[PDB]
Design a protein around this nucleic acid. Structure first.
Lengths: 59, 77, 110, 141, 187
RNA sequence: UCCCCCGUGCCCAUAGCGGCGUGGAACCACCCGUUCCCAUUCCGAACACGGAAGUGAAACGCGCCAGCGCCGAUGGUACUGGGCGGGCGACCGCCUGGGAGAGUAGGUCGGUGCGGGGGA
RNA sequence: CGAUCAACGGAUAAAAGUUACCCCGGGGAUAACAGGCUGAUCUCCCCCGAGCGUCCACAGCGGCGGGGAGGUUUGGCACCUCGAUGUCGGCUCGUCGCAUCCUGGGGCUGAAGAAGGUCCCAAGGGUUGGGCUGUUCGCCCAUUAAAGCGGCACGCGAGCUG
RNA sequence: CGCCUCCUAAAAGGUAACGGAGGCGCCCAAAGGUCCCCUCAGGCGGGACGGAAAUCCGCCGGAGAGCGCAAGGGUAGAAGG
RNA sequence: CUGACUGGGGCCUGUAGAGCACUGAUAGGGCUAGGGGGCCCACCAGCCUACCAAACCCUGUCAAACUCCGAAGGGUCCCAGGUGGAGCCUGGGAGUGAGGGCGCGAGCGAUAACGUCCGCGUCCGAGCGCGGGAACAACCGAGACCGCCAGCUAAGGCCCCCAAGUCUGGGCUAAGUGGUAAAGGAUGUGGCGCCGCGAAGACAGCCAGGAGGUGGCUUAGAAGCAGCCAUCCUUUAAAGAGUGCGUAAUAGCUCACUGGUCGAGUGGCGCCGCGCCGAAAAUGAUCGGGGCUUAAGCCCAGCGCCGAAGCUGCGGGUCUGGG
């Protein structure tokens, strides 16, 4: 499926790798959504920053 | 008091340099080791210092044989 | 547990396996002498000669001349010329040596 | 008192205490045991003191089982010296103990005697403990 | 004796929960079967204190099964000294090995002489018939003085019972006491 | 195409140790000598040659055994990536992902290729 | 080929000390005083109670060990101050804490009374003069109800002394 | 104060401390090359001197011996003799 | 397009862990060399040794420099994503090479330090811009282009100061704990579970008695309350040649125990939550204060609300890229 992604927490203070995972999804600011196809890689980063971001499975 | 201790030698950076399934050129260092932690095999030559290197080009092939120790193979493309 | 025999066998045969050329296994029984060439990377016995099969007699060494030439001839029929002579646990002398000669004498390369 | 008669390294690092009692966490030899309940070291002076207390309270019969040994070399520098300039001297031999460790086993003793003696030994030791008994749990161990 | 206990089949539930629910995670098995199961913590404690490894235990399965089995092994929370998982050896046929109790019938005369009886092995290692499992092997501990000990070579066993250890493997010793009389010399 | 043997190989003990039985048709081994080839820091022990009186005793081959050994589950847990809290501290809890070693069950007295020979 | 060019990436081929007679530049990047954090040490207090205490663990005690508190000792660190935070001692002036020396109250006693021991509550007031020594400290003299321990930058030098 | 081994050192490498341990400043003309041949330690038992341990023999041993010197690694299917 | 990062796969690792297979350490046994002892004792050996004590065996452990094992993870190659103030190459200019706090993993240290020294991450530095945390660089939230008398939210709060609930339901605490520290102690309290007896009547208050020869190691002449060697039956509730006062003598008191009078719990265990003491330093105290007790405390459950320079809305500026 596709994945509406809602950045819902600041990345400050978290390790730079997790931030780069945010950049991999293109998420740049708070309250930023991005519907992105549920791929094992993209879902990889998404799982990596699940605590920082909201995942809403969309089409 | 004093200190008998406090001295140590430089780091050697020993160990494997190329991993299995990793294309390489002949004459390249593979296992900067001490003794034979890996014994060379197919197309794998070993310098005087036990260093393993690709005799030929091709692919790195790690292969243990249990009682026969761990071998390395460069199987060409 | 190994023996001087066994350890010696693995010794020479490892020394020759390290080369890569075809090994020429050599069996020397009390009443027979056997021989063959094999591709270790295939574990496949290519050509097989033997005093047992060749049905020879006389000096066992001379019989090794016999089977040595024979195996050399069959091998040449197979084209294999450069080949490693596995003397195995045997001392390179007598029956084994003269057999290797008969393979050379048979026209084989080593 | 209790101390390793020889060791490959006189001095030694401190190390972390986190985790549980790896081995020796069930009544194995004696009838009753005084398990630890909080990670901490114990000096051989402390261990031997607690043993002497136990043997006092029993005073007849019974058999103390010291299922811990103070092998780790406790270390402290001479007093009033600036930091550094080497590692301190071997101040004594302690034994690391985590929760779950069956420290002391008393056998050949009535229930009340062993319970009380182990209680006193608990007061002599620097850690909260828990007198216990051998059970099928221990029997399964 | 027969110590029954209702058995429950944990399917995939996290044993953190079951343990949180007073349900002791466990498993019964043989060379034929294997089932992730769970039982009441307090029930298995009640029974198992009676129903130690020495004793047959009959699981009361939910489907109606009643397997006379054995607790070959049990996991213990080292931090709490609490059980955390049971290894139910489903005691089917083909006589197997287990631990029988040990009955020190009598008193060591050295114990009568102030000695202290130290039980080396409190249970015995035996491979006996699954349905003829003796729960006691008494011991002639009368002829014993301080400094005395017994070994496997002297235990008399019932029929069909097999010593599953070395005959020279001792079982208990009559050791000297712990006396304050030897302490003032120590202070 | 099946069985046995003889040589090799790979997998690297579930493959080993042990005990038991068995093999001589062939094969092999032991063996019968040391003139010769060859050799012993002495020795035909080994090595080597000629040979086949005898024997399968040994060795070795194969089967049986779990005694040893080795392998070993399932579960469970320790442990831990990550995210959470607690604790004065030593250190500890939770959710999330991974996940042991130990033991237990149990399993193994090998599998398989190549070639040669013999038999069916 | 000549390297203890070993301070071993080797400043010359060639080189040691002292300064309170000192000077300059800097530094709170770094010590001495203080203050700060820790409380190792120090003081105090509790736990166990071995043993003592005619007996009797607990009137008095308290082996072996343990747990604390404080922050007066000596320490550790080096955080502010090295374009200055004047350092011991004494004098003056005090203020405060209580872990109370006396005075107030009380409990127990191995409290007959008296005098005591210990502990609890108690900080209002007091807690002497002198010899020695720079001293604090301590000893001593004579007394007292007592002759407290400490904090206040080891109080107090833009208050004195030196 | 330079270099080697180990731990520190967190399963890549590297990784500090006046941290925990030790070594080196050479040696071998064979202790090098190659060919061939052998396999140890250890234990038992028996064995003149002769032992605990000399050399001998038989029995069991995968390496626990050795490998010029620290440690480590490597290693008898040899780098050991 | 190669980047960080991610997924798939391959492989390298010896750490945590675990374990004793090696090295050592190690507790207790068995067995047992061997040495010590006793006799035996020399003419030489031998018997015992609850002496130590090889080695081995069993049980139990231990380790940074131990490893039969061994993760999680990490590294690397390739494939896929990944267009980013990403990456790579070459030139130019740098500045920095005093760092620090925090968390985690270690060493030193005293498992002390706002300590030191390292690794990993982070933040400050340079973000002492903003909200919370009272105040406070690194703790929580959050990366400030600007303006707006707009809105939703973050941590955190909603009884006044001070905006939002004296908001709801359920508990617990009575210490102002909350709103400071341990060991240790405790009929605190609440809630659990376990055992004992409860009407062949419970605890319970009562009551009525509770003993003998009297004698034994018989002596500090107390058969029993004094040092011990003791503990027979019986006086037809049956109460001990006793449990503590008089006992170098009896007493008498009392107790375990015998009935009944009441008539329902009583009693003891272990666990958990929240509390108490433990708890003394120096200018005046204080939860930030006021004040707070079915809370305005703690825990659980709910909703809503407040809440920043986060985000959203509007307007504008400016840089890069695309038109």
């Amino acid at each position: 499926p596709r994945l509406k992604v809602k950045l819902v927490k600041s990345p400050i203070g978290y390790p730079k790798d997790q931030k780069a995972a945010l950049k991999a999804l293109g998420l740049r600011r708070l309250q930023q959504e991005r519907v992105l196809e549920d791929t094992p890689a993209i879902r990889g980063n998404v799982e990596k920053v699940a605590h920082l971001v909201r995942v809403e499975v969309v089409e | 008091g004093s200190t008998r201790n406090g001295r140590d030698s430089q780091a050697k950076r020993l160990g494997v340099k190329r991993y299995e399934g990793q294309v390489v050129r002949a004459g390249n260092i593979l296992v900067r080791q001490r003794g034979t932690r890996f014994k060379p095999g197919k197309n794998v030559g070993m310098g005087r210092d036990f260093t393993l290197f690709a005799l030929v080009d091709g692919v790195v092939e790690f292969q243990d044989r249990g009682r026969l120790g761990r071998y390395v193979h460069v199987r060409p493309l | 547990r190994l023996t001087a025999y066994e350890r010696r066998k693995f010794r020479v045969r490892n020394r020759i396996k390290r080369t890569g050329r075809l090994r020429l296994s050599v069996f020397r029984s009390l009443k027979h002498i056997y021989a063959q060439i094999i591709d270790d990377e295939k574990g496949v016995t290519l050509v097989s000669a033997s005093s047992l099969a060749l049905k020879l007699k006389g000096n066992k060494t001379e019989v090794a001349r016999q089977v040595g030439r024979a195996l050399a001839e069959k091998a040449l029929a197979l084209g294999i010329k450069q080949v490693a002579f596995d003397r195995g646990p045997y001392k390179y002398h007598g029956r084994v040596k003269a057999l290797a000669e008969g393979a050379r004498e048979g026209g084989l390369e080593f | 008192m209790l101390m390793p008669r020889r060791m490959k390294y006189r001095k030694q690092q401190r190390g972390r205490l986190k985790g549980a009692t790896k081995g020796g966490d069930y009544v194995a030899f004696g009838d009753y045991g005084l398990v630890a309940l909080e990670p901490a070291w114990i000096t051989a002076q402390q261990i031997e003191a607690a043993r002497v207390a136990m043997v006092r309270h029993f005073r007849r019969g019974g058999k103390i089982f010291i299922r811990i040994f103070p092998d780790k070399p406790y270390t402290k520098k001479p007093l009033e010296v600036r930091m550094g300039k080497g590692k301190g001297n071997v101040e004594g031999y302690v034994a690391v103990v985590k929760p779950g460790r069956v420290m002391f086993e008393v056998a050949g003793v009535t229930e009340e005697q062993a319970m009380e003696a182990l209680r006193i030994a608990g007061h002599k030791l620097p850690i909260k403990t828990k007198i216990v008994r051998r059970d099928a749990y221990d029997e399964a161990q | 004796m027969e110590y029954r206990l209702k058995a429950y089949y944990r399917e995939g539930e996290k044993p953190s929960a079951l343990r949180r629910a007073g349900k002791l995670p466990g498993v019964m098995y043989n060379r034929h079967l294997n089932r992730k199961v769970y039982v009441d913590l307090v029930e298995f404690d009640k029974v198992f204190r009676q129903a130690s490894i020495h004793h047959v235990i009959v699981l009361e399965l939910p489907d109606g099964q009643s397997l006379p089995t054995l607790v070959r092994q049990v996991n213990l929370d080292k931090r709490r000294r609490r059980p955390e998982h049971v290894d139910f050896f489903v005691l089917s046929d083909e006589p197997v090995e287990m631990y029988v109790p040990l009955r020190f019938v009598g008193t060591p005369a050295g114990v009568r002489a102030g000695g202290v009886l130290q039980e080396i092995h409190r249970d015995i290692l035996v491979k006996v018939s699954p349905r003829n499992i003796p729960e006691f092997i008494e011991v002639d501990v009368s002829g014993l003085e301080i400094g005395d000990s017994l070994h496997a070579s002297d235990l008399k066993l019932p029929p069909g019972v097999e010593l599953a250890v070395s005959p020279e493997e001792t079982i208990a010793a009559v050791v000297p006491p712990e006396d304050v009389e030897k302490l003032a010399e120590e202070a």
